[PDB]
Amino acid sequence: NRPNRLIVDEAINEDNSVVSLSQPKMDELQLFRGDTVLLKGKKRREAVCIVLSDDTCSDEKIRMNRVVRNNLRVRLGDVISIQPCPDVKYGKRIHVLPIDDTVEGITGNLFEVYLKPYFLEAYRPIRKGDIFLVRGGMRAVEFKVVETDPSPYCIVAPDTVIHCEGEPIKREDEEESLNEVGYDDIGGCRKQLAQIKEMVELPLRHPALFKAIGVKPPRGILLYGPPGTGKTLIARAVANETGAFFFLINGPEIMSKLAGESESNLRKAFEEAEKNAPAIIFIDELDAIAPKREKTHGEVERRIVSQLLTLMDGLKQRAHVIVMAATNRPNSIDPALRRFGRFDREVDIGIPDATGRLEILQIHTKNMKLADDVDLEQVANETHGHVGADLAALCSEAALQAIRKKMDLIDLEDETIDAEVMNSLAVTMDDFRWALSQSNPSALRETVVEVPQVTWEDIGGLEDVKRELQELVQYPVEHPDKFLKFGMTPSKGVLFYGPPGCGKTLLAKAIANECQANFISIKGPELLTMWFGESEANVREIFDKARQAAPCVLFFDELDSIAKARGGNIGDGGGAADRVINQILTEMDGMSTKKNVFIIGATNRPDIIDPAILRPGRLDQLIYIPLPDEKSRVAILKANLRKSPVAKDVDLEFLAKMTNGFSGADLTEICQRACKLAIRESIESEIVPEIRRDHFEEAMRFARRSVSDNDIRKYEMFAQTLQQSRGF
Amino acid sequence: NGPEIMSKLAGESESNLRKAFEEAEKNAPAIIFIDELDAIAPKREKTHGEVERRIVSQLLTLMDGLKQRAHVIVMAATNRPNSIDPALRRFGRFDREVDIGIPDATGRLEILQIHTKNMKLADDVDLEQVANETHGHVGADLAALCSEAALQAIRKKMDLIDLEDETIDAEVMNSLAVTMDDFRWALSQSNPSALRETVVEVPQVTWEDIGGLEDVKRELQELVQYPVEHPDKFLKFGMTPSKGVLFYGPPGCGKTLLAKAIANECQANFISIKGPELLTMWFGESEANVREIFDKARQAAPCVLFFDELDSIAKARGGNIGDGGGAADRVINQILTEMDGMSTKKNVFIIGATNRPDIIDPAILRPGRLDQLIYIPLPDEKSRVAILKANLRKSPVAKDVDLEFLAKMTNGFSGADLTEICQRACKLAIRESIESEIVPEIRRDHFEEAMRFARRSVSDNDIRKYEMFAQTLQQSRGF
């Protein structure tokens, strides 16, 4: 249907007037990447913009910003027409003025702060119907053009004289503000937007089709995640972005109201928003109003949760609605709300990663001006547990640390301030380092699921067991073609066992990095404290959080501490078991081989373990991690100092010889002392940097075999037969 | 609806609940269906305050105080038989029970076809495979798996059509289909997350699926097949069938399979309760769900009830050296009170299995509980072919192999460790093929390399220990 029909999509780049396409559309287009284009759009309102080319788009799709996409009165997923035409020319007048409340409280000269610096060397097209936004000085400014050089197009040149009175504008009746949230105000969530985006999209954009079909569009959604994670943000974003009518319910709000006042208040919310459909209904803190465990005292609270049910279930299809609620943990809410015809969908919005945090940090760092020494790629690596709302108050508190010490000397106090200071005001790296050091980065910290940073090169030796792990994880994900042809079935779990400090934890994080699978780590002590006094109930959740993360490596680390809890050494009269070992391996038997979740245990004392976990179908492949030998003992040293400035004098072949029964962790203990003996001489020297050969000679003096000899023969005995361990 | 009438104001419900019978008294013959009887009649520690305790006693006086009225029948629904006031199950109240379980694959295919009727499908679809890939699924899961797969089709198909108007006509829909790539996609989302709990089914395993063991196969059909087949006999000669069996032997020698084989043979349902799962529901110092697995066994008869890896429980109390006391828990006792409960006129049939007969409680060996003891030995050469011959029956082995030759070099391998050889061989084959992308057929050299790393799973010095218990495990009670 011709290359006059294009679709809307949301840009990767942040720049104001551009559109990004691909070469197939270019081999359809045959026009430049520096050209101007005049686009046609809905409601007789159209606008002028330029194009470039790039791979991130598909064969056919169109990247835009909101500032473009709003004037065109279009939304993501609308048919647009680029109209590839070269009308190219300069314009003349281009008289602009600021917008109603967007300048409220800021005053003064706008030429050198705003406007001018935005146009320079990047002449930007303009039309009588372009509103645009300029970022700076802690503020988002909005503009409009009542007249310019006559239409359609005007293209600035590094001359053109712009003239502006200032003063507000009349607020446009229907024209949205750009300060309303949209898919660009959310970051780190990319994967769960597209999930929410598909699922809610077409029944909002295409109310008719469903009325034409017998398909039931899912209507109800539950968003998980700990507080401050952006649940309420993601909700309103979608409602704005999709065009829907967004009504909002607070839990406390309707539990604040008088008994019997809530019922009419909760009922009206649907009844009213029934009339305005298509409609979103968002319920903040569903936990407040529907808390069924031992639930509540007295009817009036037990009554309102049954009112909610008869609205969800007793929804007859009404006309058209979709309900969205939010809560901190999936639990604590009445189970009867998750049945079908009620909130059947679930979207778990976890904490962000560093790649997510940098995405967030840039969003709250946009509008403000920064010094050149800032990094923000390092910050994301120094903020560990942080949700989005922590990481926003880390930007706004760092920026108040800047404007206290800067303008206390200016000490100017009046009704409003103008932009020159703000423009010549910046935040430095010393502030971020300061606001990161307060207790504000105190933040919620719980089970994290991520792709690990460790690579294969980060571990030395072990080259064959590296080859065997990729057999057992890489391939069944890579080649589902095979394993049908030859039949059989992949084995699910693995068990590493060996001397302490020999590399088991690392080698589990390496394959996750290799297959880009998520990695969940559950350490024996942590697992056994949540059992607390005689109760846990959270184990089934780490298998859930593993299930919705697939492909996933699920790693049970230092699995020996649990068995020695029941008892170690001499031993009890009984075997080594707890009620938290049993509910693990009921749940292993639960997960299907069609799942690509993959389990790995590790133990430093194979002597003690429960045979139940070695049974075929639980942890079958047994892998014995030996101590390193000379040629590998170089690989270890060669590795962990890869970031250390070692001097040329050293012989790593020589270290590796004098050492024999050292663990890989104890080699790092030598390399550790050497480096800390170096810094003592340097610090002395303040009354030259490099690591020196003599240093390694002194460190090597105090080195310590971490594993005894007489216990090496014990690993060598279990290396042979650990299969025998079950049955007697 | 339960919530409906619990939504209404206090005292509004009474008149609302009463009218439902009073009205539908006038329109008889009449059904009265009560959704979620759990909402309105939850008596355990039951409730707070009268108004909720009042409405459950209003319901009772309607059920019991039904005088025969004219003509009515009441139907209610609930998730678990428990949680509802016991006083509602007395006679003149809901005395009937119909347990509607989860479906089987034969059931799921039946469902899938019902929500797949009206829609058009591509020819590559199967639906007999889907039913085998959807494991825990209830009907409502398996319906939203059809409607979400069919939305995956009409998003990518008509987004290019991008036609938006008041109504659409049928040509597209007719020329619109769903493919197998969609089902595979919607099956891969987390929507197939579904409730998964004790399943009762006829097992897929056959006799041919296990090699060797030809006499103990003959003895199991004596003990299960015949009293169901020939109730004529067992009267003529008198006596009585024995109820339970106990398999014991080295690990990996085929006990679990051989229990699922007879269930398949007599087309009896099969319930499996594994030692760990049984001992975690005891949770902290409480279970209350054991009597239910004997109920779910009772209403399923003819039923094989299989207690698998029954050793993990006894080693819980303690294994090896041992405690000062015997191996027991409060979850062993409430099993064998309940075994003594079920009558020989029931055709429910119990089977245990253990890898450590040394440790077990003698109480379960008493005549009238688990009487027939059967010792499952390790395979021998002629049987070790039958095992290999079996588990690769679906594998494309090349003609070069000698299965007679494998079986010789192996002696004390378990049947499960033979599969461990046959397992490695097949995974060493796929490595060469995957290399070869920069020919399919298992090769003789492959089995020669796999055989290199093979591992005796059972020690020699513990084989003489099974041979000693093989002789006398009856002696174990009394000292």
Ligand SMILES: Nc1ncnc2c1ncn2[C@@H]1O[C@H](COP(=O)(O)OP(=O)(O)OP(O)(O)=S)[C@@H](O)[C@H]1O
């Ligand atoms: N092959 C190796 N390559 C690099 N570092 C190693 C290696 N083996 C041990 N290490 C060091 O040991 C530390 C982590 O040890 P792990 O890989 O967890 O071994 P582990 O025995 O599973 O753990 P523990 O705590 O020593 S019992 C790392 O900081 C490494 O410096």
Ligand SMILES: Nc1ncnc2c1ncn2[C@@H]1O[C@H](COP(=O)(O)OP(=O)(O)OP(O)(O)=S)[C@@H](O)[C@H]1O
């Ligand atoms: N006679 C046999 N025929 C076929 N497969 C067998 C046989 N014996 C053992 N196996 C293999 O062992 C696996 C299941 O073993 P089971 O029959 O459960 O023996 P078990 O000793 O009761 O169970 P475990 O886990 O080995 S203690 C199957 O996957 C089979 O491949």
Ligand SMILES: Nc1ncnc2c1ncn2[C@@H]1O[C@H](COP(=O)(O)OP(=O)(O)O)[C@@H](O)[C@H]1O
């Ligand atoms: N993914 C994200 N991207 C950008 N900002 C975020 C994100 N997540 C959280 N925030 C910040 O969190 C703050 C409030 O979050 P909120 O919507 O209240 O989350 P919740 O409702 O889950 O508590 C907002 O200021 C927003 O800046």
Ligand SMILES: [Mg+2]
């Ligand atoms: Mg470790």
Ligand SMILES: [Mg+2]
């Ligand atoms: Mg078994």
